[PDB]
């Protein structure tokens, strides 16, 4: 209408976008500054990289767009674009993305008093430090650094506005905790000018379900699963085919585990010591099993049972285990001939009984490493799973 | 020409392009917001982004873009290119871009009484949630939320116009089932006034016989041959190799299914279900043929066979099968030469007939374990792929 | 110099860029459109999405920018960038590009009498539709539309041109047949105004030989290999390793190639199929393997060999296949032992008879489903391979 | 300073950028376009793609920047940014970039006479032709286009300089050959007046001593691995999965190397027939295993040995490995008793000597395949490698 | 206020963008060039790009650009932004991104007296050489050269300032060792005049405690259970699966690390020599186990065991080990019955001793190449792994 073309016509009269709107030069500027989380779009692990979508919120009070409103009677506010008025220079420091500056510049919106509005909105784009120690039961903080570039605090003073999370859509893998803000003055090596500026902390919660299901329960299921060459007699050549495929599996899970992590030497991460305590036991069981096949497949004529290790196979784990041990010159020909046949049917007898033997001590020496190796499983696993902390909070927010 | 030159010069004389162009300034500007949906390009499950090819329509009249058609004879329409008309600044609320606005700017189509036309195209893509609970046999919402973003109730009157899919070109992945549309108006913390809005929900149903063909007739197949290791004798040692191949392989498939899935923790998927199930069965499998290789290699000095095993095994499951049982000094000293060989052959007889005992109890076993998990599997998977809900629509429409 | 200064001063004089340059305002205004092909950069399956390198050509007189040649003796063309004079404002409609202009912007050739020439270059992305159903042995159909956005038929008169493809560079996997094209006119909802537009088609040829080397052969010399497994001695347990570790590659190869394809439920592909056909015939290989399996390891008193299949086997396919079918107390005292030790040894006679009869049925048996077997394998395989169309000629061309 | 600023007013009057600089309108203006090499980025083969970091050189004379040094004594060059000055349109016909310009545009340098410079650097992306028929041992040509867009022969005199590679940082994978460039003219449909361009090709040579470590080192190793399976016992029921999981590890190769390699029909690679020819090795090594272990499981009773194949297996091929060639009533009762035992263990030794020969032509018929097989894979490697051309000098340059 | 509108309306006035800020013409004008580093974003091997997040800094002094504070009470500093005042054209010369400038344009603070600051941030990608030598144990120097582009070394006087660390963040996989700065002059083909640059070289080093975790010990551990196919009796049939099995998973491993690497061909890497050494050593392994099975299964009358075999294995190699060395009518022919029974007896007895005799050979060599390999397996390792420099102190820092 008539009224706001000149209203528009007259506020632009002499106004310089370069110019600190202060009715005083030597008095600063307050800008409160805050922010509106809507959604946390990405956690990148491996690069070390947040995105989330929010929208900056900035007020300041402008000396020169003030207007009667009777002059104006229908006029109440009025829209200034990108480049024909001032404003803060308000940036994020710890950006990780190829082109600084990711907000979408849009219209300011003023009073007739003055009371300038700012809401810009974008895909921010922040490089956090990620924690791996706990994964997959981790909590990870990561700070958003905002702050004037080139206005001083003697020029800009910056305001902290608590941010609001009521338009928040939660994310289906990460929990939101809470976003507390802090502002503080830093000193930088350009300038003997103090620089506010203020960081908000974003904390977030991993749900476990999908890793659980999906990495967790199937390690000890295998793992369980290379138990059973234990229970398998040695006549079936079939042990080292499982123990080996078993092993071969697991490595297979360690790569796939660890194209998603990152390259980072600050520490062990529990999924690493977890996975290298399933391999080791395997190992270990490969190797028992090719020492039990050493005692099952031996040699008579090798050489006789160390009366050590008969005495404490055959005696003391039997005990323990409850084994079972097993256990005319015509005439004078024939004769002859028939003596030699019956002896050599008793060297036969007696050379399997030594067999005999020996293949009981490698079944018991089979089941005592059975037993051993099953405890040593599930010591394990319940003291690298329980070590984490809020582990427990962590299944009973998820699983139950 | 002479006119169109003429009117061009005339129009723009005094135009500010920030001054909305109403006759009176109390009162509100009708604007008619629509759509066009022309293509679905993408949906990202595992980033949860949809992109859609879609036309923006808006059309609200201009009470300074007004002429007398008689002045200038051939003059009908004028186009005006960007930032030299006031245009309002709708924008996409819920964008998962880059950049925020992903709009191509085009020209605006005037009538000779002020109707203003603007159809901007673009690639749009938006953050909506996608649910895999169901999947492969899933339907979607995904809602595209447009407004103004700094015009308040009082000053743009968004209204809703039903969108248009005249010049849609189908998908061969998913099937569109409507695009309805609502307006509302919310409440902000920035500021007192309504701001209205107008929300698309695009509903579409995925097409299974891709997924059916590709990943659950291979899963059947592998779980079906798994079931072979109960034909084959315990002679041919090939029954830990076939099972434990056929785990590996079922194990990659898993791999393979999880890289194209989200991270979530909502709820455990079908396809999860199922692949849990499957190998649960095959893993039992496993374990029920060590025991049976455990029962056929039974050395016979071992021990005697309990009476309730033994009786159970061999009664009772075989009549439910059917199942076939099988079954003059010198003179002494050669008489007692001869008396010692017959009686070992008699003795090795009798060891002989305690091991075909043992191996046919075996075999009694493997036989009923084959029905029970073929039994097992068979209600498993029915079970599973019929709870989802459509799983029999969806079927018809894509196979039958 | 002076004349093309003085020239270039009197053009811009009272020119306005927004106005169309028609002498009469009630006349459409002709433009000549055609299109110039340089280069096929990609074909997208997964994506469906087709990258080329194209010259844009469009043409109209401009009744403003004329002169007379006399006056500027040495002066014949003129040149303006972008934003100087008017140009059509043609797009393409079916773009795939995240911004939807993917033309480079350069300056249009203007004669002394007004004609007008524009040639952009540019990267086109655009979103057709590609058809997997014969695949590798497909021809493609993707289309280009072109139109002005805001320009009726009553004021914008849009004219085709045959395409130019003298400059065309050959690409290594697409064969290119042809581009012609068509110029109609449509009704949208937007308006009462028919707008015209121009599309051209390109039909390319994939060319097969690289598919053909890289994954047909090595599916079918694997299938060949997955018959030798009946011609492994039954003795050797090695018949089930052979047939999983085929079927395990062969898996494999159908996730690598399942990678690279669309997942459309449009129709099921020609390499599908035949994956299919091939995974199936190796599964019912080792169905046929564990049957032989159990027939050769037969238990002698597990019972006779039923009539009818005894008969079949050892009549009918032998004849066919010319099967050989193999085959004074004391004396008393020392009297029954040696009776008895005889008819111990007649016994295990016959049980060894009756083990060789079983065994020869096996071989039958495998002999038997080797030659099946070998003939269905042949015939799905041409048969598959054959119903494809331009399956010859695409040989011919390729490999020929 | 004063001097500098009175230039910069004086220079800008009457100053038009569109206007070409030359002092008579009919005569060309000379420009001489050169190029500087940097770095090879990166080389694309299966985008057909090369990246390059070059500085473009310019070099022309404006009749209007002239100036007296006298007048201004301490000026000697200015510096003009983008729009200020007219430039030649000078640009990469076959870029491969999604906006077709890639060049930085930066000052231009002018004499105190008139001389400009224009050096603009950027990261060129260029489709050229890479073929990959002698990969790993191939050199490439790779062309880039350069000329002036909507200047004529008329109009613009594109003139050539030698191509400068002093500061040229060499690459650890690419070896530089040479630089050398073209001018032509060339005819277009659009119009009837020649346009000159400069063409440079870039000449480089792939360093082989990765390629040769990585890929043809293991293929060889493995290929002779694979000849293994003719020195293990037929006994040890271990040769079919030696050969089947070598198979495996080829066909993982294979996938391997086709991952990086375009999908083009020109010509079968070199690499392409190596893997092809080691793979059909292996298979017939697999064929030959299959008919050694049937030769020597034989049953005794399934047939005599044919006449042809006996005296060839045991006397020619025996000759030529000098293979070692292996070789009262009850008295009555109890003597047809030990007539029957004795008649039952000759016929027993006999048949145990018929096997003894089957095996013995077993291990024969393995000896010659062991000796063929390996002299035809060393041929066929041989060949393949030396096939190529270069491959010498490749070698003697990376290895030596 | 007043004064601010005031100084910032008067400054402006016959200012040039274009002109140098030199009082006098003929000096030159001093800037002081420095840098800021913030974070290392990321080290790309395979593409040798590194990307950094850093602030530059430049200084210089306006001649223009100067007042009295006493006029303008409250005014200090004045800010201005892209296009209103000189700036040095200062560019990285080794970028690596598509479009040569990474910086962020900001604003420039003026002091009262002249004095200008310009501190632009932005993420650099510049192409580094990366040396992978002694991967994972490299120390990486990577340069980053910055200089004016159009100003010579008559016009604008480069600096160097030294680098600035203070607000480094330290990255979790690469350790800062310092950044030190050179400045030198350069002559260029383009003209006669040096151009100053100043060139900083970023050093860094790996740290190495993932890459020990995840490569190095899992080939170790997988390299020493290799050795395990020692331990085996031969009558198991399980070492060929073992040897091959565990080469084909270190083949994947080769293939897994090989794809994180660049494809150079200047040297051998470290964890190259280590696989290669690896491999070797688990294919002679495998032909030793080939050669013992042969021994083993070795058939009695092939031959007899030549003399200096059987001396030296069954001697020396026994001694060296302590290795246990095992070891009417109707009466004659009865009698020439039991005859014939005994002397089979007897040779089977012979029989059996000779391969008794070649069975402990095969032991024998079994055990000495365990042993050997063993020595030259640790022997291999540890060189390889200490033949790279700093690996002591890596160690130290990184695990202790
Ligand atoms: C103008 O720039 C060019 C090169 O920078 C110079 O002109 C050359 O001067 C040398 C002698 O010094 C001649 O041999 C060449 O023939 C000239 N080149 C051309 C294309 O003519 C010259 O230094 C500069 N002119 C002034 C006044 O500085
Ligand atoms: C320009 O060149 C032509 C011949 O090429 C000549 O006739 C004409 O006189 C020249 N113009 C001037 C002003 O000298």
Not at 113 to 126: A, D, M, N, R, T
Not at 155 to 173: C, F, K, R, V, W
């Amino acid at each position: 209408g008539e009224f706001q073309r000149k209203l528009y016509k007259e506020l632009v009269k002499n106004y310089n976008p370069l110019e600190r709107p202060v009715a005083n030069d030597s008095q600063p500027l307050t800008v409160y500054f805050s922010l509106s989380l809507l959604q946390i779009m990405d956690v990148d692990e491996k690069n070390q990289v947040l995105t989330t979508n929010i929208w900056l919120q900035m007020s300041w009070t402008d000396h020169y767009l003030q207007w009667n409103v009777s002059e104006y009677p229908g006029v109440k506010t009025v829209r200034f674009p990108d480049g024909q008025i001032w404003k803060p220079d308000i940036l994020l420091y710890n950006s990780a993305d190829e082109r600084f500056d990711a907000t979408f510049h849009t219209n300011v919106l003023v009073n007739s008093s003055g009371h300038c509005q700012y809401l810009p909105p974008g895909i921010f784009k922040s490089s956090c430090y990620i924690d791996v120690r706990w994964f997959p039961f981790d909590v990870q903080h990561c700070k958003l650094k905002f702050g004037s570039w080139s206005y001083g605090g003697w020029s800009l003073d910056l305001q902290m506005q608590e941010a609001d999370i009521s338009g928040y859509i939660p994310n289906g893998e990460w929990d939101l905790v809470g976003i507390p803000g802090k502002r503080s003055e830093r000193f930088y090596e350009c300038c003997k000018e103090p620089y506010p500026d203020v960081t908000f902390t974003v904390t977030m919660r991993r749900r476990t379900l999908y890793y659980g299901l999906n990495l967790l329960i199937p390690c000890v299921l295998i793992s369980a699963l290379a138990l059973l060459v234990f229970l398998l007699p040695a006549d079936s050549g079939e042990k080292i085919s499982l123990g080996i495929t078993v092993l071969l599996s697991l490595t297979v899970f360690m790569l796939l585990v660890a194209e998603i992590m990152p390259a980072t030497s600050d520490s062990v991460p529990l999924i690493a010591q977890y996975f290298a305590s399933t391999m080791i036991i395997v190992g270990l069981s490969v190797v028992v099993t090719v020492i039990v096949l050493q005692y099952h497949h031996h040699d008579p004529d090798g050489g006789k049972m160390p009366k050590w290790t008969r005495v404490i196979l055959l005696n003391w784990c039997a005990w323990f285990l409850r084994m079972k041990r097993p256990g005319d010159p015509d005439l004078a020909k024939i004769l002859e001939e028939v003596r030699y046949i019956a002896n050599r049917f008793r060297c036969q007898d007696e050379s399997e009984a030594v067999c005999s033997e020996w293949k009981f001590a490698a079944c018991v020496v089979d089941r005592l490493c059975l037993m051993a190796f099953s405890v040593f499983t599930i010591i394990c696993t319940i003291g690298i799973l329980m070590s984490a902390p809020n582990f427990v909070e962590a299944v009973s927010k998820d699983f139950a």
